[PDB]
Amino acid sequence: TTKRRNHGRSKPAHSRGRVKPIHCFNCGRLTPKDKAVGRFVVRRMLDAASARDVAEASPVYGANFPMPKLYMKQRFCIACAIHSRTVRARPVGNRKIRYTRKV
Amino acid sequence: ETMARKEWYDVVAPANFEKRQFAKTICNKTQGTRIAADVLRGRVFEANLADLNQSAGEEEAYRKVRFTVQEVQGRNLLTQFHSMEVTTDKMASLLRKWCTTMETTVEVKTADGYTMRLFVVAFTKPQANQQSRNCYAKQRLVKWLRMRITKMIKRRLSKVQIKEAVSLLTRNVLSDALVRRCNPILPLRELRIRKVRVVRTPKFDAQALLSAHGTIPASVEADQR
Amino acid sequence: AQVGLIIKVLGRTGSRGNVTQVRVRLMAEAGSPDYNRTIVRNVKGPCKENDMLSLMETEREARRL
Amino acid sequence: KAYGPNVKKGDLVYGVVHIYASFNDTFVHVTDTSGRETYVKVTGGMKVKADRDESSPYAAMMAAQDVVARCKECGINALHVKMRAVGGVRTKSPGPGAQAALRALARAGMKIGRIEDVTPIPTDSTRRKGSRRGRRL
RNA sequence: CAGAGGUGAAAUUCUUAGACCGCACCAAGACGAACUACAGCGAAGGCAUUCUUCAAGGAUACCUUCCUCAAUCAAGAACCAAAGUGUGGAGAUCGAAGAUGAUUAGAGACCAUUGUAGUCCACACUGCAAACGAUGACACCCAUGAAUUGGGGAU
RNA sequence: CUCAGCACGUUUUCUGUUUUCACGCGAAAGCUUUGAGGUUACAGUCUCAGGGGGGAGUACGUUCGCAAGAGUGAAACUUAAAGAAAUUGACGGAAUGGCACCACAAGACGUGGAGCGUGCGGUUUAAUUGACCAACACGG
RNA sequence: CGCGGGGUGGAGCAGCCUGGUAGCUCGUCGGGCUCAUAACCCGAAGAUCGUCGGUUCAAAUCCGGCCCCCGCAACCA
RNA sequence: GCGCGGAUAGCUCAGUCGGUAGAGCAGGGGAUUGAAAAUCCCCGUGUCCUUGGUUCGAUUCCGAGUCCGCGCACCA
RNA sequence: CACCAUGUUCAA
Numbered sequence: 007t008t009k010r011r012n013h014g015r016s017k018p019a020h021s022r023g024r025v026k027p028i029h030c031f032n033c034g035r036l037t038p039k040d041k042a043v044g045r046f047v048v049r050r051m052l053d054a055a056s057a058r059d060v061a062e063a064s065p066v067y068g069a070n071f072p073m074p075k076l077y078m079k080q081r082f083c084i085a086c087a088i089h090s091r092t093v094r095a096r097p098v099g100n101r102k103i104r105y106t107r108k109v
Numbered sequence: 110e111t112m113a114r115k116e117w118y119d120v121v122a123p124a125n126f127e128k129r130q131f132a133k134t135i136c137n138k139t140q141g142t143r144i145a146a147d148v149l150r151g152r153v154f155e156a157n158l159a160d161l162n163q164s165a166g167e168e169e170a171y172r173k174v175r176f177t178v179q180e181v182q183g184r185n186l187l188t189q190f191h192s193m194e195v196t197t198d199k200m201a202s203l204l205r206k207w208c209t210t211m212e213t214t215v216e217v218k219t220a221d222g223y224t225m226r227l228f229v230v231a232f233t234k235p236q237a238n239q240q241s242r243n244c245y246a247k248q249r250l251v252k253w254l255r256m257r258i259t260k261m262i263k264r265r266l267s268k269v270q271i272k273e274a275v276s277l278l279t280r281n282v283l284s285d286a287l288v289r290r291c292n293p294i295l296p297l298r299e300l301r302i303r304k305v306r307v308v309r310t311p312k313f314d315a316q317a318l319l320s321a322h323g324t325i326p327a328s329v330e331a332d333q334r
Numbered sequence: 335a336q337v338g339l340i341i342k343v344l345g346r347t348g349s350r351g352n353v354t355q356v357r358v359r360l361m362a363e364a365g366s367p368d369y370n371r372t373i374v375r376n377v378k379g380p381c382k383e384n385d386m387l388s389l390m391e392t393e394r395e396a397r398r399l
Numbered sequence: 400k401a402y403g404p405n406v407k408k409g410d411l412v413y414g415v416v417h418i419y420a421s422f423n424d425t426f427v428h429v430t431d432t433s434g435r436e437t438y439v440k441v442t443g444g445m446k447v448k449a450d451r452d453e454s455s456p457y458a459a460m461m462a463a464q465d466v467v468a469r470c471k472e473c474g475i476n477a478l479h480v481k482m483r484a485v486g487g488v489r490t491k492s493p494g495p496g497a498q499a500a501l502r503a504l505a506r507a508g509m510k511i512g513r514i515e516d517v518t519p520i521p522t523d524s525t526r527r528k529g530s531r532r533g534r535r536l
Numbered sequence: 537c538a539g540a541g542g543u544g545a546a547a548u549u550c551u552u553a554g555a556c557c558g559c560a561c562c563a564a565g566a567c568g569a570a571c572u573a574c575a576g577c578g579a580a581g582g583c584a585u586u587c588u589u590c591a592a593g594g595a596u597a598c599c600u601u602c603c604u605c606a607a608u609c610a611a612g613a614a615c616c617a618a619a620g621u622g623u624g625g626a627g628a629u630c631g632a633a634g635a636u637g638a639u640u641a642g643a644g645a646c647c648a649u650u651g652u653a654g655u656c657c658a659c660a661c662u663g664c665a666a667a668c669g670a671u672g673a674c675a676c677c678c679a680u681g682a683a684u685u686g687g688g689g690a691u
Numbered sequence: 692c693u694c695a696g697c698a699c700g701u702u703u704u705c706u707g708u709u710u711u712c713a714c715g716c717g718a719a720a721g722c723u724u725u726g727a728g729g730u731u732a733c734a735g736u737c738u739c740a741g742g743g744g745g746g747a748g749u750a751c752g753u754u755c756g757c758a759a760g761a762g763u764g765a766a767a768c769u770u771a772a773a774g775a776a777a778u779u780g781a782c783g784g785a786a787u788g789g790c791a792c793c794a795c796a797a798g799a800c801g802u803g804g805a806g807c808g809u810g811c812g813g814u815u816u817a818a819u820u821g822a823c824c825a826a827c828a829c830g831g
Numbered sequence: 832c833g834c835g836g837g838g839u840g841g842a843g844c845a846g847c848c849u850g851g852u853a854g855c856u857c858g859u860c861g862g863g864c865u866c867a868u869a870a871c872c873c874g875a876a877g878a879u880c881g882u883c884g885g886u887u888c889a890a891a892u893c894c895g896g897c898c899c900c901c902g903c904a905a906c907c908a
Numbered sequence: 909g910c911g912c913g914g915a916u917a918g919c920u921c922a923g924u925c926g927g928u929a930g931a932g933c934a935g936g937g938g939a940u941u942g943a944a945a946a947u948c949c950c951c952g953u954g955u956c957c958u959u960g961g962u963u964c965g966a967u968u969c970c971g972a973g974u975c976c977g978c979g980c981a982c983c984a
Numbered sequence: 985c986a987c988c989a990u991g992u993u994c995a996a
């Protein structure tokens with residue numbers, strides 16, 4: 007039973023032979039780069055309660071000059087993406103939905 | 110007590126900058142076999158370029174500049190440009206996904222003797238009416254974006270001195286004149302000199318250093334309170 | 335200990351549901367530095383909004399949700 | 400009583416605080432802006448007795464208050480902040496102690512200059528700890 | 537200057553002969569992040585910085601040349617991931633074996649600290665993959681709508 | 692100026708990697724100009740392998756290899772199913788949304804300790820005449 | 832045989848006040864948790880210190896004779 | 909027999925230089941908890957090896973001596 | 985992300 011056409015990974019049949027693996031973001035498991043689920047997070051450094059304390063005590067930072075943030079590009083193992091609930095198991099008809107941009 | 114043996118010293122930039130005296134520091138008093146003036150004369154001082162030229166606009170806010178100590182005049186640390194670098198928060202926000210990213214490295218030997226790398230990064234953009242999914246680039250054209258940048262920095266910064274070259278790297282005179290000439294090769298979303306480093310230096314001339322500071326702003330910490 | 339007023343009850347938290355997540359306004363004396371400051375804190379016991387309570391260390395905020 | 404430099408009462412003297420939060424222990428380290436001179440280094444494992452609390456944000460907060468106590472003695476009115484995770488080949492996401500350390504310097508009246516994350520990012524990586532199958536839990 | 541590390545909690549381990557941290561630098565060996573994707577190249581293994589080079593490869597364009605030269609294949613040839621082997625280098629990091637912690641009823645395992653062979657290069661050998669699209673090669677016919685890569689042609 | 696340039700827009704067309712979509716096909720899952728279609732209405736060409744599950748990719752023989760091994764490759768004996776795809780259910784130290792004082796929470800009042808009453812087991816005895824959350828002051 | 836070592840709760844081992852129902856790990860019991868067993872938790876029991884004498888206020892210890900077990904040696908013509 | 913160190917509850921150990929003992933840890937209780945290990949809070953507990961000179965007052969000062977370490981000695 | 989091993993033979 008082929009659970010999914012493309013077999014879990016972005017490689018088609020006659021395109022690549024292999025893709026060199028990356029380590030998982032927390033597991034450290036080596037999975038191929040096209041297989042491993044990849045999220046680019048734009049996480050702020052401070053919570054909006056905590057950022058308001060720091061922006062008030064800052065000569066630089068205010069409503070005019072915004073505070074920096076973290077830009078890190080996480081890539082996870084498939085065991086690692088389910089367990090951190092980055093990704094979840096979806097119904098059989100619902101598995102083909104593909105999101106091309108961050109919602 | 111450890112602050113009982115510390116003397117406050119003041120760090121002066123060269124004459125290019127508006128706020129000359131930045132980043133007050135400490136150092137030990139001289140014991141006698143080791144002098145403070147030799148321990149200080151290799152230190153590197155990182156300062157934001159918006160905290161120096163005193164005219165922001167979120168192009169200077171995202172570059173810090175490093176200065177290395179040449180001469181010690183009492184409480185002043187007479188410095189020279191060590192490196193400049195676009196900060197890590199601005200640089201990671203410039204990458205989008207579906208475009209392409211060219212990274213050039215050019216080795217420049219100035220007319221003073223300073224050898225430097227400049228690490229230019231560039232990014233393609235889509236056009237206004239463009240319906241395509243990606244707008245990548247031909248690798249013939251990214252090698253001529255790279256060839257023209259490498260040719261144009263080795264020509265403009267090999268005539269100049271080092272005070273002039275830092276004034277080219279600051280104020281975006283070099284970068285704006287490098288976007289405009291490299292935009293008819295490929296559509297460029299952003300061309301930004303990412304970091305520049307002084308790699309090798311000429312042998313230390315004292316009169317060439319004092320000329321690079323104009324008038325030293327005369328620190329106030331060989332003092333009574 | 336500063337006396338803060340519950341202006342919002344954010345729902346029952348914890349595993350067993352005995353702890354309540356509130357949003358407490360600090361109610362200082364209006365010339366103070368930390369006046370009209372609001373904190374998101376965990377309350378143990380039955381708490382409705384507009385219920386004053388004493389706070390030992392007001393500089394902590396609880397992790398929401 | 401104050402080993403500060405020669406200025407008025409109003410002037411801001413800057414140092415650079417180096418907040419390093421791991422998931423094991425958080426550091427708060429104040430230097431001179433060259434790094435070559437250290438004013439105070441207070442770590443979160445000096446505030447708590449158990450090793451599991453050393454990474455916690457409350458131990459980062461108490462370590463942040465011990466810094467402000469000495470930085471006033473040294474005459475440091477304001478700070479630039481360089482935050483970092485462990486980086487390199489490791490997890491690159493900042494720990495629990497990071498945002499609570501920074502909030503406790505602003506809450507204690509230390510003026511905050513320019514926030515920057517200087518976590519070590521490789522252009523290409525050495526091989527990371529753990530096997531091909533990674534850490535298994 | 538008084539602890540760092542590590543964990544689910546720890547303990548092996550490092551540390552007032554100064555660890556961890558912070559700054560600039562140096563050395564050595566690997567590796568080329570983000571960009572990096574249902575993208576390209578290659579017969580398959582496989583291939584990801586740059587610049588100067590060497591011989592090639594396919595596609596496309598063509599009112600060039602050739603004129604059946606082809607298809608597929610026992611036998612026979614040359615390639616073939618990783619581990620492995622031989623001889624020299626290298627030896628940074630990860631690390632089969634092994635050693636210490638711990639968990640456990642036991643733990644010869646997972647987890648932590650290490651650490652040999654190996655990892656990396658040169659020249660030989662091997663020819664064992666979930667070597668996969670679990671789909672032999674070459675032709676033919678075959679409805680539809682988004683896209684995408686390279687070449688060419690119209691505006 | 693790698694500049695009679697670069698990218699785009701609308702449209703043609705060849706080559707490549709694909710995608711959600713008509714027949715048809717299949718035991719189904721699924722495949723579908725990229726066939727698993729054009730097949731009992733069964734023949735375009737060539738080629739390799741399979742013949743119930745094992746034993747067994749074993750033994751012997753031989754050829755390669757420095758060795759590890761590799762290629763080739765049985766039988767005696769043994770078995771009545773092994774498999775394949777789907778359905779319905781039950782289960783998960785798998786997600787997700789609910790619920791219950793025969794669950795917890797926050798508490799109350801106790802049982803388990805003691806003495807007795809009574810039921811159950813055992814041991815005795817001529818005999819000490821069902822049930823083991825949903826048996827044990829219950830068969831009134 | 833000379834010489835040297837030990838006999839200890841059912842098992843394996845300790846034992847420096849000359850002396851704690853003598854101590855340890857395991858086992859045996861009785862109750863819990865479990866649908867049940869194991870693990871786990873709460874408890875309780877069990878010693879002729881091989882044996883006979885003797886030193887002593889008091890002996891597993893201290894001195895003995897015995898019974899066992901286990902070795903070291905057992906030589907050069 | 910010469911100099912250095914060690915003796916402080918069962919175990920472990922820093923001392924105020926001559927004004928009264930401390931933490932570490934084990935032993936009995938509540939807390940965590942549904943049940944753990946770890947974590948917490950609470951009640952044991954050392955005449956401070958023997959002697960003196962006994963400084964207002966000796967774990968602390970000082971003079972011998974037993975005990976234990978190292979590095980040194982060496983003619984009945 | 986502490987630990988969490990197992991349930992005799994046919995038959996209904």
Ligand SMILES: *O[C@H]1[C@H](O)[C@@H](N)[C@@H](O[C@H]2[C@H](O[C@@H]3O[C@H](CO)[C@@H](O[C@H]4O[C@@H](CN)[C@@H](O)[C@H](O)[C@H]4N)[C@H]3O)[C@@H](O)[C@H](N)C[C@@H]2N)O[C@@H]1CO
Pocket residue numbers: 683704705
């Ligand atoms: O070779 C092509 C063939 O001739 C033709 N039948 C075509 O089929 C489609 C066509 O599909 C492609 O749409 C692509 C654009 O999204 C386009 O590709 C082309 O893009 C242009 C811009 N870059 C060209 O410059 C480029 O060379 C070219 N590859 C088409 O190929 C549709 O656009 C039509 N609407 C319908 C046709 N049936 O596709 C063949 C290759 O795919």
Ligand SMILES: [Mg+2]
Pocket residue numbers: 023024
């Ligand atoms: Mg492969």
Ligand SMILES: [Mg+2]
Pocket residue numbers: 639647
């Ligand atoms: Mg474990």
Ligand SMILES: [Mg+2]
Pocket residue numbers: none
């Ligand atoms: Mg290691």
Ligand SMILES: [Mg+2]
Pocket residue numbers: none
């Ligand atoms: Mg009865």
Ligand SMILES: [Mg+2]
Pocket residue numbers: none
């Ligand atoms: Mg069994």
